[PDB]
Amino acid sequence: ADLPQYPFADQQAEVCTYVVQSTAVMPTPMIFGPSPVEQLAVIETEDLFE
Amino acid sequence: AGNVSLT
Amino acid sequence: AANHSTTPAILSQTVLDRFNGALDPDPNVNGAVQLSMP
Amino acid sequence: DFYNAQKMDELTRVMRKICDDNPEYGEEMVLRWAHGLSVDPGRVPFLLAEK
Numbered sequence: 001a002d003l004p005q006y007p008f009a010d011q012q013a014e015v016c017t018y019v020v021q022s023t024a025v026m027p028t029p030m031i032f033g034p035s036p037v038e039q040l041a042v043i044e045t046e047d048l049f050e
Numbered sequence: 051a052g053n054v055s056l057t
Numbered sequence: 058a059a060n061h062s063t064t065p066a067i068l069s070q071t072v073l074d075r076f077n078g079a080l081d082p083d084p085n086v087n088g089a090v091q092l093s094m095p
Numbered sequence: 096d097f098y099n100a101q102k103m104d105e106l107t108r109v110m111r112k113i114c115d116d117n118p119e120y121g122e123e124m125v126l127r128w129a130h131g132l133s134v135d136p137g138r139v140p141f142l143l144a145e146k
Contacts, residue, residue, distance in 0.1 A: 036079035037111055042126050045089055049085070049103055053089035056100060085107045090097040 005011045043049055073079070113128055114121040115144060119139045 031075070035077045036082040037108065038079050039081045039083055039105065040110060040114075040122075040125070042114075042122055043107065043110075046126060048126075048129050049106075052092045052094060054091050055087075056097060056104070057058060057087040083107060085100075086104045088100060088104065090100055 003022075005015055007016045110128075111123045114125045117124060120134045122144055
């Protein structure tokens with residue numbers, strides 16, 4: 001459970017430092033949906049669709 | 051005054 | 058025209074553009090059709 | 096109605112791109128586009144290079 005790390009200056013410190021890079025591409029049966037749109041202030045303020 | 055909606 | 062100092066930088070991608078969302082969807086897309094009922 | 100609509104859904108989406116592909120003149124060129132008008136070109140700035 002306790003492994004002393006003799007050669008390092010600090011025995012109890014986390015001696016290693018790691019950087020991970022995981023990339024996953026997952027074909028799925030998910031449905032998702034269409035993107036929405038933003039309000040237009042020219043149609044209600046001028047009645048283009050009269 | 052109502053609407054059946056398109057969806 | 059009253060600015061007299063350097064401005065902050067500009068993001069390369071907005072949060073809404075990242076998730077292709079919208080603050081308020083329009084009422085016309087998949088909208089409502091008038092109904093007669095006198 | 097619902098026949099004049101079901102292209103209004105199509106017609107408002109093309110109206111969204113003309114005011115988005117050209118951020119300058121946005122929310123006004125769509126007004127002129129519907130009536131068949133055009134904006135004056137020289138006022139707007141434009142970009143030269145990006146690195």
